[PDB]
RNA sequence: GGGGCUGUUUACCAGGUCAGGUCCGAAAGGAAGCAGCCAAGGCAGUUCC
């Protein structure tokens, strides 16, 4: 389940936004994304770090989520 | 070394374009710009000088 899924699943809007920011790479292994590459999402989608770290905690839960089924 | 070609590689760190999203504006409209792509670079092979 990586960031590919969770983006085919208007605050939507601004998640995706988010995932349109990334690289195959990041949307691939998620983990590898730290600092300064959250700093070129966020500002690459008009958004702030906040919003990012949201939205990979939302992944987190929802990755966690089906890593238990 | 340089030119050409081919394969491969490269988040951001003054290339171009810029989906999506963002900024400013009552509007009309401006502004910046991620991913992508292109370009460019790196690592090689080949060929020409």
Same mark, same amino acid.
């Given at each position: 389940?990586?960031? &590919? %899924?969770? @983006? !085919?699943?208007?605050? @939507?809007?601004?998640? *995706? #936004? $988010? $995932? &349109?920011?990334?690289? /195959?790479? *990041? =949307? #691939?292994?998620? !983990? $590898? $994304?730290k600092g300064s590459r959250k700093r070129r999402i #966020? #500002?690459?989608?008009?958004?702030?770090?906040? %919003?990012?770290? =949201?939205?990979?905690?939302?992944?987190?839960? /929802?990755? =966690? /989520?089906?890593?238990? /089924?």
């Amino acid at each position: 389940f990586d960031l &590919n %899924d969770f @983006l !085919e699943q208007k605050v @939507l809007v601004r998640m *995706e #936004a $988010i $995932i &349109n920011s990334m690289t /195959m790479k *990041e =949307r #691939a292994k998620p !983990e $590898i $994304i730290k600092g300064s590459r959250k700093r070129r999402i #966020a #500002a690459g989608s008009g958004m702030q770090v906040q %919003d990012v770290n =949201r939205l990979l905690k939302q992944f987190d839960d /929802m990755q =966690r /989520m089906m890593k238990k /089924m």
